[PDB]
Design a protein around this nucleic acid. Structure first.
Ligand SMILES: Nc1ccn([C@@H]2O[C@H](COP(=O)(O)O)[C@@H](O)[C@H]2O)c(=O)n1
Lengths: 147, 158
RNA sequence: CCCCCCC
């Protein structure tokens, strides 16, 4: 059972991270969702979500190694994903502002595909700007182009 | 914080051992104590697959092991994780950028800004270009955008 | 325009 496996695995790490952490794992469409509550959560998240991503990444890998490909897993704490999407929706809305004036394209910072997706999605059918990614790997980033 | 040898060694052995079992049963683990720091190497199994895309996996294991060591003992013991000469090949890539910067800067007489870099990586740049007869180094900026600038020992007149 | 490779 993928849920029970994640519970034992993520429960193992959570104990070493903070005894106040508690875990809920649920499926929501195609996506396995792991929510952490309790204790100093910012310490769990870490600077720029660095700790939460390391857990999420490793959780994904041990999940793939036992059950195979096709799973989507997202790990979250105290609505940190929302805030990160909102901040991403901002700055992108800011990009369409700058590119609107200056007819010169604008290069956004590198982002993983899930975050580039959000940029593409917000600026969908924007009257002034389009989006298209560039570069490869950790280099890859969205470019805001003018019409 | 407690002595590196003893519990911190055994703690990391058991923690990484459990993680490596799920990643690949072929993995074995050597954990070395260097003074009051810890060093850990993963051997066996598919090491390419352990490292993962652009090293994301080895790095997430390193980061997380550091964090849980700090939670357990109060320090990360400057833990450094390696596999299949990963750390060495990345030390070389950083050295390459600094080399190409040295050449360009000594020619143009203009400073060049290297890509932003963690302090660990910034040290490698500084050390490689110490006592370099044509260029020098000095960092600039704050936070994630702190990066080494390579300066010509003798500036362009202009 | 997921993300881990079984890339
Ligand atoms: N000339 C230099 C400059 C920095 N360093 C090292 O590089 C690290 C990064 O410092 P910067 O902020 O100067 O890049 C320092 O913490 C120090 O260990 C060095 O070893 N020699």
């Amino acid at each position: 059972d993928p849920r029970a496996f994640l519970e034992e695995f993520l429960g193992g790490l959570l104990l070493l991270l903070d005894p106040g952490h508690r875990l809920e794992v649920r499926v929501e469409g195609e996506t396995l969702k792991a929510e952490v509550k309790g204790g100093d959560l910012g310490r769990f998240i870490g600077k720029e979500g660095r700790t939460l991503r390391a857990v999420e990444h490793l959780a994904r890998v041990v999940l793939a190694r036992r059950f195979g490909t096709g799973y989507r897993l997202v790990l979250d704490a105290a609505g940190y994903r929302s805030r990160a999407e909102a901040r991403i929706r901002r700055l992108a809305e800011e990009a369409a502002l700058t590119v609107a004036m200056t007819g010169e394209p604008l290069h956004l910072p590198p982002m993983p595909p899930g975050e580039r997706r959000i940029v593409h999605m917000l600026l969908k059918n924007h009257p002034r700007v389009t989006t298209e990614s560039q570069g490869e790997g950790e280099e890859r980033h969205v470019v805001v182009y003018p019409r």
